Amino acid sequence: SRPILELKEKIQPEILELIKQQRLNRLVEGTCFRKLNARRRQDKFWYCRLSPNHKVLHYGDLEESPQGEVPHDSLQDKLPVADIKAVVTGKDCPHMKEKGALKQNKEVLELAFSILYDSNCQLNFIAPDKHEYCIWTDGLNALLGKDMMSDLTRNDLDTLLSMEIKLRLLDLENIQIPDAPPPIPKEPSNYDFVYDCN
Amino acid sequence: MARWIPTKRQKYGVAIYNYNASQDVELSLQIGDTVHILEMYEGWYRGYTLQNKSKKGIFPETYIHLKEATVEDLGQHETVIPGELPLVQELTSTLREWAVIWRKLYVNNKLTLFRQLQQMTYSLIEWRSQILSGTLPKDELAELKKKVTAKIDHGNRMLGLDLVVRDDNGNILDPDETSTIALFKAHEVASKRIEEKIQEEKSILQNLDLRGQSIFSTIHTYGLYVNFKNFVCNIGEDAELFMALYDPDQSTFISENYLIRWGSNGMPK
Amino acid sequence: YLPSIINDVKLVFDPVELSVLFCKFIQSIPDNQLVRQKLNCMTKIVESTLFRQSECREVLLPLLTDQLSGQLDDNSNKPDHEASSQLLSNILEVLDRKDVGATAVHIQLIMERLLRRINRTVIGMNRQSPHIGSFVACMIALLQQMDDSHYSHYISTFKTRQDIIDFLMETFIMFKDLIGKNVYAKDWMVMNMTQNRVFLRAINQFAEVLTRFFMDQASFELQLWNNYFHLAVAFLTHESLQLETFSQAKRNKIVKKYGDMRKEIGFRIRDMWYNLGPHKIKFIPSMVGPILEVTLTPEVELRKATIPIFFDMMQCEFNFSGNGNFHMFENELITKLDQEVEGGRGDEQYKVLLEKLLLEHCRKHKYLSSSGEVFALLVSSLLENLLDYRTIIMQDESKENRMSCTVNVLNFYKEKKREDIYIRYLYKLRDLHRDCENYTEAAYTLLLHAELLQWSDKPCVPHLLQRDSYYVYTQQELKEKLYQEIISYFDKGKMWEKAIKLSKELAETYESKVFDYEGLGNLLKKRASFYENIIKAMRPQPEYFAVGYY
């Protein structure tokens, strides 16, 4: 499977942009994320819609909506996509560092993400579970246009590439690919095709 | 390059690996890029591709795996068995459409039915590969044909895709404008299988006995497999174990008694 | 069980003697005895022993026809519909066999004995839930197996021309009733094309019978071309590029298996229209629209073929233009062109080719074609306007841009003074603002509509007689209704100054013409209420911002 793998991993990017496109679709459809220590009657759930323009972030303290995203003006429909320094994960979240009233327990260690903007304002938010935590980190990193930090993302990458190459190998049944590519038969220096072009 | 020739014994324009960009009309041709070569050179081949049947590409013979066979598997008698190889080509095209809709699936929140489409896709591809060989006995040929036809038509039906007919031999003889009423009832049998499967997702996926009753309504003889492991008793003498089926309601036995000799040492004689 | 023996007993007997014995046995059933069961009997009968027919079919069927024609229309057809359909199917299949023996003559006998029959049936047998699909399948199988010579044999050679006229009219209307309101799940794709092709064949044959017995040959009774062309268009109005586009092979599969059948329909209608000749003008204003949408097919060629027909009909009017010109033509032209284009149908290349062709034709022709040149110039402007409209609609989908572009097209129409479509788009905006509660803006637009009217009683134009309710509506009364609505708006529009303004001339009209003193009372009640509102309540000041686009 040597040239097989060479070809498979070598034709990477199409699946990559496909997965990233799906991630943007996911951020756009979004959901109600989670706040910090929203216990004494606080809307822990609150929708965070990425624009179909993928530039504004329709997020803010929306109600305990079980339906999730509701298309309207959130509290702050804008998070500047360009200036986001990064998102801190786990202990790097200063809200995870908080040990007072907003002390997040160790059971949300992987749900802690703070989106960096204004260099003094943070988005200390919580995911409902790890997989979509990684999903939204992947989505913002697609906004960052970089690698993806979801385990599920590599899962989908490898599996879909596997099926694609697996369906690719249909025309080449009962054939071997020499690991050294077959020698290109010499092209005669004349391009005066005896039979016409097209 | 010169001396190109028109021919139709190259329909399987076959790559080897992702081709070099050596020609101005060639790219890293996919492994599954069956291309319609129009013009034939000895060591080279240029013509249409499945990727773009309106465009040429000069492909090496050392890269072209020549297959004189064409879309018809019997004119050159390429059939490992006649009337079947069609089936693989249209199911492969069907697989292309499953790939397209697969793209349509992940990008949407159909991931449950999408995942079940994944698993039937994998069953389809493994059946495809196993029937690539002609080693099967003809009964199993028919069995695989019908089961995969049901699966692919199921794939069509939750995807609302159009219907096919001619259950046997490539699903194509009927759409060859042979009759009308036989065509009508072919469509009717198709709809009948449609209703069968649409009523049976709720019958099997959720329930575990309707499938059993439907299976038991098709055959009339059965057998119970008993795999004895060890006898737990304290006799110390030879024991002759008469085990069989009994009808307590009728106070009678139902199967002949299977005599088992159990030894005096606790382990069967 | 009597059929259960026919095979082997024949294998040891004379064919025809046994055959006639069974026939005489069957006819000896009185008309009310086990009709379904006799149908099953004879169905098993025609099943076997009909593999040979030369000695039997010509004598076996006669009885079968007799009993089926009794099954045609006796108001006792309700139980035997399914079984008769079954028998019809089986016998037609047996006919469809080729090894079975020659049956062409027998085929025409089958028409001559069952065809008007099944036509009557399917016309009356006309509810979708029952097995009407089976009847349809049978009759299309028929038309498939038939022959043009057979169609022309007697179906073209009936009794008096009125009978054949009425029969063909019924045939056309039920064709329309099938094509329109299709009888399948749209999943039975294959039979859908087969049905399309067989209907193609049939409508072809009826086109030639119309030509041969119904051109200026029948110099009169030329009305039914209405029905013919309407059905032709409706049939032509489906199974197109995108519908052929779903799978990639879908185009290819259909083209190989069926080609471009709509191409055939287009050419057929083109030559037919050309054949109309002198009666074209006698027929234009109805058919005007019917040709545009089919011109608007997403294809290229039959389009190429169809645009010149516009020049053909304007030329025909030019022949009639001894009085005026194709005003009446171009009006419906523009109107329908609007409805279809705003429906989201055409394309740019379309309008390009339209202008090119029409100008090319008008070069061949005279002054009236120079006028037609300026008219089609206007037309092309309209087309690009609407195309821009729809591209922006699909580009932004924010109601504001929709409002902008529709305002643009209102301005264009006001320029073009085709006041009807003008009003139409006005009401579009009225709906829009109602959605946005721009009671002020909505009332303004509604007023612009009302602005056109006069306090004259006479409804001088049914153009303004809209689709909200279409009857007499004496003009001043329509004005009155509009004014009431506009007042209601302004009142909830929190802007009573215009309310009072309008109320003044409303009350004037009352006292001067209708004397509707109760209406005076209500109106002045409202005016006083609004004056109170003004003096009493306070309303917010709206900020005004400037936007500089760059």
Helices (H) and strands (E) in chain A, counts: 5, 7
Rounded to an integer, what distance in angstroms lies between the CA atom of residue B102 and that of residue A7?
A: 22
* Pairwise CB contact (< 8 Å): B183 & C247: no
Count the helices and strands in chain B (H runs, E runs): 5, 7
Neighbours of B60 (CB within 10 A): 23
Q: Are residues A60 and A152 in the same domain?
A: no
Q: What angle do CA B63, B67, B71 make, to 5 degrees?
A: 125
Q: Are the beta carbons of B262 and B240 closer than 8 angstroms? A: yes
Q: Is A150 helix (H, G, I), strand (E, B) or coil?
A: coil
* A79 and A174 co-located in one domain: no
B17 contacts in A (CB within 8 Å)? Answer: 3, 6-7, 177, 181
The contact set of A with B (CB < 8 A) is 3, 6-7, 10-11, 18, 21-22, 25, 29, 156, 160, 163-173, 175, 177-178, 181-185, 187-188, 190-196, 198
CA torsion sign for C450, C456, C457, C461 is negative
Domain boundary among A146, A161, A188: A146
Asked whether the beta carbons of residue A3 and residue B15 sit closer than 8 angstroms, the reply is no
Burial C283-309 (b: 16+ CB within 10 A, else e): bbeebbbbbbbbbbbeeeebbebbbeb
Q: Cα C190 to the chain's mean position, in Å?
A: 23
Question: Are the C-beta atoms of residues A20 and A149 closer than 8 Å to each other?
Answer: no
Query: Residues in chain C, how many?
Result: 550
Angstrom resolution of this structure: 4.3
Query: DSSP of C273-297, one letter per residue?
Result: HHHHGGGSTTTHHHHTGGGHHHHT-
Q: Label residues C205-217 b or e (16+ Cβ within 10 Å = b).
A: bbbebbeebbeee
Token pair of A104 as six digits? 């997040």
Which residue(s) pair with B45 in the sheet? B40, B59
Q: Are residues A37 and A129 in the same domain?
A: yes
Last residue of a domain, one of A131, A146, A161: A146
- By the 8 A CB rule, do B65 and B51 touch? no
Token pair for C124: 């009356």
- The rounded distance, in Å, linking the Cα atoms of B59 and A187 is 11
Say if residue A164 is in the same domain as residue A95.
no
Burial of B247 (0-12, 13-18, 19+ CB in 10 A): exposed
Q: How far apart are CA A124 and CA A198, in angstroms?
A: 62
Look-up of token digits 């993928």: A54
Cα–Cα distance, A65 to A119 (Å, whole number): 30
Q: What is the dihedral of CA A130, A132, A133, A139, to 10 degrees?
A: 150
A136 and A41 within one domain? yes
Spatial contact of B182 and B223, defined as CB atoms under 8 Å apart: no
CB contact under 8 A, A7 and B15: no
Answer yes or no: are the C-beta atoms of C145 and C186 closer than 8 Å.
Answer: no
The candidate with the shortest Cα–Cα distance to A79, out of A127, A114, A32, is: A114
Radius of gyration of chain C (CA): 33
Which of the residues C190, C193, C196, C248 would you substitute to probe the B interface, choosing the one with the greatest number of B C-beta atoms within 10 Å? C190
Distance between start and end Cα atoms, chain B: 84
Q: Is C251 exposed, middle or buried (0-12, 13-18, 19+ CB in 10 A)?
A: middle
Residue B259: half-sphere exposure toward Cβ, Cα within 13 Å: 4
* Determination approach: cryo-EM
Q: How far is C185 from chain B (nearest CA, A)?
A: 10
Q: Are B182 and B174 in contact (CB under 8 A)?
A: yes
Q: Please, after which residues is chain C broken with C–N above 2.5 Å?
A: none
CB A108 within 8 A of CB A89: no
Q: Answer for the pair A191, B53: CB distance below 8 angstroms, yes or no.
A: no
Contact C293, C343 (CB under 8 A): no
CA distance B231 to B269: 11
Side chain identity, residue A121? C
C492 Cα distance to chain centroid: 43
Q: Which residues of B touch A (CB under 8 A)?
A: 1-5, 12, 14-18, 20, 22, 28, 30-34, 39, 43-44, 56, 60-63, 65, 92, 95-96, 99, 102-103, 106-107, 109, 121, 125, 132
d(CA B106, CA B100): 11
Instruction: Determine the distance from the C-alpha atom of residue C378 to the mean position of all C-alpha atoms in its chain, rounded to a whole number.
Output: 28
In DSSP terms, B258 is beta-bridged to: B243
Residue B74 and residue B79: Cα distance in Å, rounded?
A: 6
Residue C84: other Cβ atoms inside 10 A: 24
CB pairs under 8 A between B and C: 55
Strand partners of residue B260: B241
Distance between the two ends of chain A, CA-based, in angstroms?
36
Q: Is the dihedral of CA C230, C231, C235, C238 positive or negative?
A: positive
CA atoms of B88 and B68, how far apart (whole Å): 18
User: Could you tell me if A170 and A110 lie in one domain?
Assistant: no
The Cα A101–Cα C280 span in angstroms is: 88
> Could you give the CA distance from residue C219 to residue C325 in angstroms, rounded to a whole number?
26
C90, C133, C191 ranked by CB distance to B183: nearest: C191
For residue B269 the two structure tokens come to 């004689």
For helices C225-236 and C261-276, what crossing angle results, to 10°?
160
CA distances from C464 to A131, A197, C14, C427 (A): 61, 63, 80, 11
Q: With left for phi above 0 and alpha for psi between -120 and 50, is residue B40 left, alpha or beta?
A: beta
Three-state DSSP class for A151? Answer: helix
Give how far the C-alpha of residue C239 lies from the chain's centroid of Cα atoms, to the nearest Å.
14
The burial class, CB within 10 Å (0-12 / 13-18 / 19+), for C311 is: buried
What torsion do the CA atoms of C306, C307, C310, C312 make, to the nearest 10 degrees? Answer: -70
Same domain, A38 and A111: yes
Strand segments, DSSP code E, in C479-540 are none
Spell out the residues 6+ positions from residue A9 whose beta carbon is closer than 8 angstroms to its own.
A161
Give the angle C2-C6-C10 at the CA atoms, nearest 5°.
145
Cα-to-chain-centroid distance, residue B137: 15
Structure token digits, residue A100: 């007072």
Write out the H or E segment, with its range, that includes residue A124. Answer: strand A124-126
* Alpha helices (H) along C321-418: 327-342, 348-364, 367-396, 399-416
Angle at B184 between CA B180 and CA B185, to 5 degrees: 125
Quick one: CA dihedral A81, A83, A86, A91, positive or negative? negative
3-state SS, C462-491, equals: CCCCCCCCCCCCCHHHHHHHHHHHHHHHHH
* Cα distances (Å, whole numbers) of residue B97 to B41, B101, B112, C495: 33, 6, 19, 60
Nearest-by-Cβ selection for A172 from B16, B43, B96: B16
* Pairing of β B35-40 and β B239-243: unpaired
Q: Of A109, A127, A146, which residue is a domain's last?
A: A146
Min Cα separation B43/chain A (Å): 6
Q: Exposure of C115 by Cβ count < 10 A (0-12 exposed, 13-18 middle, 19+ buried)?
A: buried
Look at residues C269, C226, C261 and name the one whose alpha carbon lies nearest to residue C240.
C261
Identify whether the C-beta of residue C10 lies closer than 8 Å to the C-beta of residue C49: yes
**Do A84 and A171 fall into the same domain?**
no
Residue of B nearest to C250 (CA): B162
HSE-up (13 A, CA, CB side) for residue A155: 7
Same domain, A155 and A69: no
Q: Which B-chain residues 83-112 have CB contacts (< 8 A) with chain C?
A: 93, 97
Cβ(B196)–Cβ(C108) under 8 Å?
A: no
Q: What are the phi and psi torsion angles at C229 (to 5°)?
A: -65, -40
- Strand B239-243, strand B258-262: pairing: antiparallel
Helix C81-96, helix C35-47: angle, nearest 10: 10
CB atoms within 10 A of CB C266: 24
B241, B231 contact by CB (below 8 A): yes
Instruction: Name the nearest CA neighbour of C432 among C466, C405, C465, C467.
Output: C405
Cβ separation of B121 and A163 shorter than 8 Å? yes
- Residues, chain B, total? 269
Beta bridge partners of B39: B6, B46
Same domain, A38 and A117: yes
Name the helix (H) or strand (E) containing B49. Answer: strand B44-49
Cβ distance C92 to B181 less than 8 Å, yes or no, reads: yes
Q: Are residues A100 and A183 in the same domain?
A: no
User: Interior CA angle at C461 toward C456 and C462, to 5°?
Assistant: 125
Q: At what angle do helices C104-124 and C161-179 cross, to 10 degrees?
A: 70
Instruction: Transcribe C402-421 into DSSP letters.
Output: HHHHHHHHHHHHHHHT-HHH
Q: Which of B53, B176, A82, B56 is nearest to C256 (CA)?
A: B176
Calpha distance C18→C167 (Å, rounded): 39
Give the residue from C114, C117, C13, C85 showing the smallest Cα distance to C56: C13
Side-chain half-sphere CA neighbours of B47 within 13 A = 26
Q: What angle do CA B43, B49, B53 make, to 5 degrees?
A: 130
Residue C472: CA count within 13 A, CB half-sphere? 5
Residue entry with tokens 């495809």: B128
Q: Strand, helix or coil at B66? A: coil
Please, how many CA atoms are within 13 Å of residue C76, restricted to the half-sphere of its CB? Answer: 12
- Smallest Cβ–Cβ distance between B125 and the set A29, A166, A195 belongs to A166
Domain span including residue A160: 1-29+147-198
Helix, strand, or coil here: C391? helix
- State whether the Cα torsion A65-A67-A68-A71 is positive or negative: negative
How far, in Å, CA of C205 to CA of C52, rounded? 31
Cα B238 from chain centroid (whole Å): 54
**Using alpha carbons only, what angle is made at residue C313 by residues C308 and C319, rounded to the nearest 5 degrees?**
125
Helix residue ranges per DSSP H, chain A:
2-10, 13-29, 94-97, 130-143, 151-168
What is the end-to-end Cα distance of chain C in Å, rounded? 91
Among C146, C191, C201, which would you mutate to test the B interface (most chain B Cβ atoms within 10 Å of its Cβ)? C191
Separation of alpha carbons C60 and A187, rounded Å? 75
Whole-angstrom Cα distance, residue C246 to residue C323? 51
Structure tokens at A158: 């490898």
Q: Which of B142, B9, B1 lies closest to B59 in space, CA to CA?
A: B1
SS3 B174: coil
Residue C129, number of CB atoms within 10 A of its CB = 6
How far CA A89 is from CA of A95, A119, A123, A125, B9, in Å, comes to 10, 16, 11, 10, 60
B97: number of Cβ within 10 Å: 19
Structure-token pair, residue A182: 């077959």
Compute the distance between CA of residue A127 and CA of residue B100 in angstroms, rounded to an integer.
32
Alpha carbon separation from A97 to A34, A114, B239, C157 (Å, rounded): 17, 12, 74, 98
Same domain, A58 and A103: yes
The strand pairing partners of A59, in sequence order, are A76
Q: Which amino acid is at A126?
A: I
Output the CA torsion sign for B241, B247, B252, B256.
negative
Answer whether A30's CB lies under 8 Å from A48's CB.
Answer: yes
**How many angstroms separate the CA atoms of A197 and B2, rounded?**
10
Q: How many domains does chain A have?
A: 2
Residue of C nearest to B52 (CA): C248
Segments of C203-342 assigned E as strands: none
How many C-beta atoms surround the C-beta of residue B148 within 10 A?
19
| C294 closest CA partner among C270, C271, C266 | C266
